[PDB]
Design a protein around this ligand. Structure first.
Ligand SMILES: O=C(Nc1ccc(OC(F)(F)F)cc1)N[C@H]1CC[C@H](Oc2ccc(C(=O)O)cc2)CC1
Ligand SMILES: O=C(Nc1ccc(OC(F)(F)F)cc1)N[C@H]1CC[C@H](Oc2ccc(C(=O)O)cc2)CC1
Ligand SMILES: [Cl-]
Ligand SMILES: [Cl-]
Ligand SMILES: [Cl-]
Ligand SMILES: [Cl-]
Ligand SMILES: [Cl-]
Ligand SMILES: [Cl-]
Ligand SMILES: [Mg+2]
Ligand SMILES: [Mg+2]
Lengths: 547, 547
């Protein structure tokens, strides 16, 4: 049995196939059947196309050698070509017309997720056209899901030559019977079979998947929608900005385009956005996923007043200042959510657009003190338990694994009351020592949070709840203002603390506020309904944060 | 005598002044003199404009309150306004029309450079228009050169109220006689004088500078062109990407826009680009200034083969891969220069444009070995001295301060032969123990390089010279190719090693190659002629690296 799987690019991981343009163009312009394909293949291994694929010449170099073959292919078949037959124009459109074959990719993902070493094996070229970035993009999205990407124009060998299959095996460190190989060209499979490999001719994807499903014994066709791409922390760009003598902010950076700044909640990290970071990068954005002050690799100074909203917000502006950014899109969840509204309200010149999950914009009531406003909500009782420094820390720090396993739970699997937490004498008092693992998290994912809170503990994070009076006096400066910058509010049906009802009055302060809502979704929106969050955020971003 | 200097924004650090649009618009549309200014000032401290400046309302909020004042200002003066009189359209154009008053900024820089604490004091607003980014940009470029930026709409006080001058002093931690204050409005100066401060009414800049020059006793007017902005290493965003189990690459990141990747030479760091990093950011780019493998905070593994071009180049591709970048503009100097040409030649899908200072693209000669090709140039003799592992390291590491002070020298102040270095028995054998400080570097700037090479030493850096045969066999793969991507070659007149002559044949391989040349310029181009380098690179970038 086999533990490797190798995929062809053109016509297998990517569709429609560029070879199909040779056929398509002919039919379209009423050219003799085969005429272009002859010109493409002219010379065999000694010909121009093979040289290109071996990386001796670039694409722009090959373009005229091909057009030159087409004029003499057409001479021998006694015809000529139209006045503006442009081979650059044919291959430009063909290559961008090519998209990822999603079912084939998901199938490669599933296999690897179940222990297979996966690789791409493609005959491709050194693309030096002006519009080459379109291809390089597709390759960056595709290659990241595979252990190896063997490109012909880099190894100096080409399918269907036996030597590149020897290379493939050396790279996979695997004997030929332990490997499947899918391709759309039969000639490319005969070398694989002679060495012993399992081979599949891809025509339609579904039958190709059916066969692969058979010989692997793994459900590939018709399986459920998988989660988005997570992030491997060791594979990320980690950034570090000193904003102040004693405060350094850490963040994870992925993608290019407009800066998008992701601000997590309590008690979380940048990893809370693992399912969003790759999506939005791919969507066309520069994701800057924070460790907010107090958490992880960001500084966590002891003082309570260091976590008031005004200080926190100034620091985020300095963060932009020092990164050379005039603006960013700001997207918050939980406490980050609140912060982000206050950024749009005090520093709108620096916010491209504002967006919050769960947390509504709540103005300060200038008559009534916050202490009483919080006291008026029985489900906010847990916040009063947090006020006394050291008490809440002791409990949360006692057993970091327990703490995270009992917090990170979906609406339909809870263990934790929020009312009567002071009275009961703690958060976990009626919840177990070893809580079950939630469906939202792997064991490994939990231990990441465990490591982060081994650094600076919970006093920093908790201090965010301990400036209620200070944030109130600040907030009251903004009571004459409105938010007229692009602004999205995303409610979660079954977040029993930040209830969607709390958001109902937001239109008074934010007139062109747009909305998103998620059915069956607890407090931990990002990992609970990642696909719906990714989708809602991308639509908004594309319509509300562009030139 | 005084050790502080405070500058007004509108009409002082930035011109033309927005108040001048009130006057300008009136004249332009044939409105009664003053009519707009009355509407602007309607109500005094109780009026709409003051509220705006105190930060009670945003700009978009104020816009209609102003238009509403204009309809009733025009009623009392028995006139009406044209059909499409738009106050948003007036203030949109006014604000972007505003540029930095460069002589005033240079004057503030000089003062601070000579020990003055400097600050901006401006009546300004919470800008929430769609085109607010234009302003936020100007403020980011301006604020970075001052110790404090006191904006009225943030402190809740406004000129000319005595309380904001009390704030100013508290912030400067300085008594009123130790501070100058420049402004274009006389009313704003009377509070400063009553407290005791020195005041200057700015009308024309040159006379305002003349006065400031007097009362400070520092040459401000007519002084020479200063260098560009350097970088304070503690103020930068520092990034860190693992590209491979044992190799982490460190880089400094500043700005937004297309990714521009700066690759330093031997034996240098990211700091070698200090004069370029802020310029290009401001020019509209995302500068990623590397520590190349072997140097500083980047990993420096012992093995010689880890610094061959092929490995180095693959690693840089992974660097892009993991940062989510499909391309970058690549700009190299010295060894970075060579690397960058080989990136354009092996991975053109990933290079937006290629650019080298000093280092020409030299193909491998397929007949003749590199050992002999290097041996054929008497000024390359120093490279042979480098081949034997440990020898060159011992000398360079013996006295790090000496080493850098004797390398980093301008064409007209040298101490170092390159011919006969093997024969003579070392680089420094006829150069002093305490070499003089070059005009290109401060003492502090030298000690930065000293600290970096205390980490991993010189063996890593030197290994870049120790794969001459391996790079040659690699290079010979590319002899059938050309570089048809945008490509700039910048020669340095008096670089006696990488002589401009070496670049003369580059057009054969690179047909649309563009050029730059710098008179009176040694090997260390970036710090020798920073302004000319910045200027040459920005022109090219704007024409050759955009959509
Ligand atoms: O509640 C949370 N997060 C949270 C709640 C529970 C939780 O689980 C556990 F408590 F830790 F066990 C973990 C995190 N965050 C805050 C609550 C306050 C809210 O902001 C408000 C809302 C209303 C008022 C008011 O009307 O007075 C004030 C602040 C921002 C988000
Ligand atoms: O020479 C330098 N840098 C340098 C030279 C001198 C120097 O001062 C000191 F030597 F360290 F004292 C410090 C750095 N870099 C290399 C030289 C080789 C060049 O690439 C070539 C050029 C020609 C050939 C060939 O024709 O064989 C090969 C490689 C890339 C830049
Ligand atoms: Cl890969
Ligand atoms: Cl999971
Ligand atoms: Cl909860
Ligand atoms: Cl500042
Ligand atoms: Cl200097
Ligand atoms: Cl030199
Ligand atoms: Mg194929
Ligand atoms: Mg002024």
């Amino acid at each position: 049995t086999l533990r490797a799987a190798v995929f062809d690019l053109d016509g297998v991981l990517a569709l429609p196939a560029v070879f199909g343009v040779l056929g398509r163009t002919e039919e379209a312009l009423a050219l003799p059947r085969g005429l272009l394909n002859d010109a493409f293949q002219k010379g065999g291994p000694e010909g121009a196309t093979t040289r290109l694929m071996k990386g001796e010449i670039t694409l722009s170099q090959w373009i005229p050698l091909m057009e030159e073959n087409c004029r003499k292919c057409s001479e021998t078949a006694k015809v000529c070509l139209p006045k503006n037959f442009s081979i650059k124009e044919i291959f430009d459109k063909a290559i961008s017309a090519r998209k990822i074959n999603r079912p084939m990719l998901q199938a490669a993902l599933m296999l690897r997720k179940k222990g297979f070493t996966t690789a791409i094996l493609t005959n491709t070229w050194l693309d030096d056209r002006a519009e080459r970035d379109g291809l390089a993009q597709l390759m960056c999205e595709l290659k990241m899901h595979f252990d190896f990407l063997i490109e012909s124009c880099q190894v100096g060998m080409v399918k269907p030559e036996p030597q590149i299959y020897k290379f493939l095996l050396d790279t996979l460190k695997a004997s030929p019977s332990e490997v499947v190989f899918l391709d759309d060209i039969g000639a490319n499979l005969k070398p694989a079979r002679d060495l012993g490999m399992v081979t599949i001719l891809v025509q339609d994807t579904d039958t190709a998947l059916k066969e692969l499903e058979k010989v692997t014994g793994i459900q590939l066709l018709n399986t459920p929608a998988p989660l988005p791409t997570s992030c491997n922390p060791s594979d990320m760009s980690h950034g570090y900005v000193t904003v102040k003598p004693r405060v350094r902010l850490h963040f994870v950076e992925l993608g290019s385009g407009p800066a998008v700044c992701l601000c997590h909640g309590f008690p979380e990290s940048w990893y809370s956005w693992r399912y969003q970071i790759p999506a939005l990068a791919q969507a066309g954005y520069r994701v800057l996923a924070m460790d907010m002050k107090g958490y992880g690799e960001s500084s966590a100074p002891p003082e309570i007043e260091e976590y008031c909203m005004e200080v926190l917000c100034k620091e985020m502006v300095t963060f932009l200042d020092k990164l050379g950014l005039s603006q960013a899109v700001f997207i918050g969840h939980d406490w980050g959510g609140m912060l982000v509204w206050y950024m749009a309200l005090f520093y709108p010149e620096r916010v491209r657009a504002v967006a919050s999950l769960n947390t509504p914009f709540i103005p300060a009531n200038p008559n009534m003190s916050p202490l009483e406003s919080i006291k008026a909500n029985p489900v906010f009782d847990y916040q009063l338990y947090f006020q006394e420094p050291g008490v809440a820390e002791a409990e949360l720090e006692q057993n970091l694994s327990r703490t995270f396993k009992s917090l990170f739970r979906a609406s339909d699997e809870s263990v934790l009351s929020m009312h009567k937490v002071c009275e009961a004498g703690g958060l976990f008092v009626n919840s177990p020592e070893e809580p079950s693992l939630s469906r939202m998290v792997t064991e490994e994912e939990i231990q990441f949070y465990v490591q982060q809170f081994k650094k600076s503990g919970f006093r920093g994070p908790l201090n965010w709840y301990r400036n209620m009076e200070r944030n109130w006096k600040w907030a009251c400066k903004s009571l004459g203002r409105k938010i007229l910058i692009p602004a999205l509010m995303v409610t979660a049906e079954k977040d029993f603390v930040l209830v969607p009802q709390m958001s109902q009055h937001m239109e008074d302060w934010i007139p062109h506020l747009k909305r998103g809502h998620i059915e069956d979704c607890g407090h931990w929106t990002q990992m609970d309904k990642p696909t719906e969050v990714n989708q809602i955020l991308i639509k908004w971003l594309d319509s509300d944060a562009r030139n």
